[PDB]
Design an enzyme around this catalytic site. Structure first.
Site, PDB file in Angstrom:
ATOM      1  N   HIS A  47       5.195   9.110   3.484  1.00 52.04           N
ATOM      2  CA  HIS A  47       3.990   8.485   3.576  1.00 52.04           C
ATOM      3  C   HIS A  47       3.291   8.639   4.948  1.00 52.04           C
ATOM      4  O   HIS A  47       1.921   8.873   4.920  1.00 52.04           O
ATOM      5  CB  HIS A  47       3.938   7.209   2.988  1.00 52.04           C
TER       6      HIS A  47
ATOM      7  N   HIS B 288       2.932   4.363  13.586  1.00 53.14           N
ATOM      8  CA  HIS B 288       2.670   5.548  12.558  1.00 53.14           C
ATOM      9  C   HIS B 288       1.233   5.713  12.522  1.00 53.14           C
ATOM     10  O   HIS B 288       0.200   4.935  13.220  1.00 53.14           O
ATOM     11  CB  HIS B 288       3.489   4.959  11.570  1.00 53.14           C
TER      12      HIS B 288
ATOM     13  N   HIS C 268      -2.324   7.235  10.274  1.00 49.44           N
ATOM     14  CA  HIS C 268      -3.069   7.759   8.992  1.00 49.44           C
ATOM     15  C   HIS C 268      -3.911   8.779   9.414  1.00 49.44           C
ATOM     16  O   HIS C 268      -4.704   8.511  10.598  1.00 49.44           O
ATOM     17  CB  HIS C 268      -3.513   6.336   8.188  1.00 49.44           C
TER      18      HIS C 268
ATOM     19  N   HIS D 258      -1.019   2.821  14.315  1.00 51.90           N
ATOM     20  CA  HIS D 258      -0.551   1.421  13.953  1.00 51.90           C
ATOM     21  C   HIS D 258       0.796   1.045  14.558  1.00 51.90           C
ATOM     22  O   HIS D 258       1.873   1.645  14.500  1.00 51.90           O
ATOM     23  CB  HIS D 258      -0.543   1.225  12.283  1.00 51.90           C
TER      24      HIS D 258
HETATM   25  N1  LIG Z   1       0.062   1.062   7.273  1.00 53.00           N
HETATM   26  S1  LIG Z   1       0.437  -0.305   8.132  1.00 53.00           S
HETATM   27  O1  LIG Z   1      -0.352  -1.557   7.480  1.00 53.00           O
HETATM   28  O2  LIG Z   1       0.138  -0.555   9.441  1.00 53.00           O
HETATM   29  C1  LIG Z   1       2.141  -1.058   7.801  1.00 53.00           C
HETATM   30  N2  LIG Z   1       2.661  -1.413   8.808  1.00 53.00           N
HETATM   31  N3  LIG Z   1       3.965  -1.630   8.660  1.00 53.00           N
HETATM   32  C2  LIG Z   1       4.589  -1.530   7.501  1.00 53.00           C
HETATM   33  N4  LIG Z   1       5.832  -2.263   7.039  1.00 53.00           N
HETATM   34  C3  LIG Z   1       6.812  -2.144   8.230  1.00 53.00           C
HETATM   35  O3  LIG Z   1       6.487  -1.922   9.410  1.00 53.00           O
HETATM   36  C4  LIG Z   1       8.202  -2.686   8.025  1.00 53.00           C
HETATM   37  C5  LIG Z   1       9.162  -2.195   8.701  1.00 53.00           C
HETATM   38  C6  LIG Z   1       9.106  -2.880  10.115  1.00 53.00           C
HETATM   39  C7  LIG Z   1       8.337  -3.901  10.545  1.00 53.00           C
HETATM   40  C8  LIG Z   1       7.765  -4.799   9.413  1.00 53.00           C
HETATM   41  C9  LIG Z   1       8.014  -4.216   7.919  1.00 53.00           C
HETATM   42  S2  LIG Z   1       2.897  -1.026   6.544  1.00 53.00           S
HETATM   43 ZN   LIG Z   2      -0.453   1.977   8.786  1.00 52.66          ZN
END
Ligand SMILES: NS(=O)(=O)c1nnc(NC(=O)C2CCCCC2)s1
Ligand SMILES: [Zn+2]
Length: 222
Positions: A62, A88, A90, A107
């Protein structure tokens, strides 16, 4: 459970894909958002405590993600310290300013000592090649997979010296779309080449931005 950003499992659908994805469609404090009207307030200063660390670089299907096995990269805002877990991207941007979508968004996802999540977002406008990202783009896995980078990586280089932000409360932009996430959205933009963005998209296989969600009751401070 398969999900994505095109076809039949697109965001408009996340809610129904399983019963634990349900806040994706029933949530009232979902991210991302279009930041239009705001409230001018005196927000506490971000203190960044990033340093070079041995990251590794993941295509999870993703996004392209940079994972931090160890603590040591932190963030201090208003007393609480927030540890960088991964960052990461987008393409295109998920959040908007006054209806404007940027070529890309990063992010930085943190947890404090109570596991209260904070996302620190950087918005990237079109421009010259990003030399500080070149190191990640080089080994960017172009399918699902993990490569572990030989040379230490310094995220300090990916943040501005000027750290004013927009502050609202929200959610994850990916299932289970979990709420209770703090969103600091930085105002000083970074830059990307069009080639860096095409290549990201090749890797991930689509535009990986969730459509903006209603603020409902929420105020965005600036
Ligand atoms: N598209 S986003 O909202 O920024 C997102 N960012 N983190 C998301 N999940 C994670 O990071 C998991 C793994 C490590 C820390 C929290 C849980 S989704
Ligand atoms: Zn994100």
């Amino acid at each position: 459970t398969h999900w994505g950003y095109t076809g039949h499992d697109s965001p408009e659908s996340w809610g129904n894909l399983s019963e634990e994805f349900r806040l994706c469609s029933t949530g009232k404090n979902q991210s991302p958002v279009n930041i239009t009207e705001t409230v001018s307030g005196k927000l506490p200063a971000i203190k960044v405590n990033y340093k070079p660390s041995m990251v590794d670089v993941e295509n999870n299907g993703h996004t392209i993600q940079v994972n931090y096995p160890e603590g040591g990269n932190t963030l201090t805002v208003n007393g609480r310290t927030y540890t960088l877990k991964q960052f990461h991207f987008h393409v295109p941007s998920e959040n908007q300013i006054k209806g404007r979508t940027f070529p890309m968004e990063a992010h930085f996802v943190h947890l404090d000592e109570n596991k209260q999540p904070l996302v620190l977002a950087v918005l990237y406008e079109a421009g010259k090649t990003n030399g500080r990202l070149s190191s990640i783009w080089n080994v960017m896995p172009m399918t699902a997979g993990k490569v572990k980078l030989n040379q230490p990586f310094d995220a300090s280089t990916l943040l501005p010296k000027r750290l004013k932000y927009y502050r609202f409360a929200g959610s994850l932009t990916t299932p289970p779309c979990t709420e209770g996430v703090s969103w600091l959205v930085l105002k000083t933009y970074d830059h990307i080449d069009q080639a860096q963005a095409e290549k990201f998209t090749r890797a991930v296989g689509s535009e990986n931005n969730r459509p903006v969600q209603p603020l409902n009751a929420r105020v965005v401070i600036e």
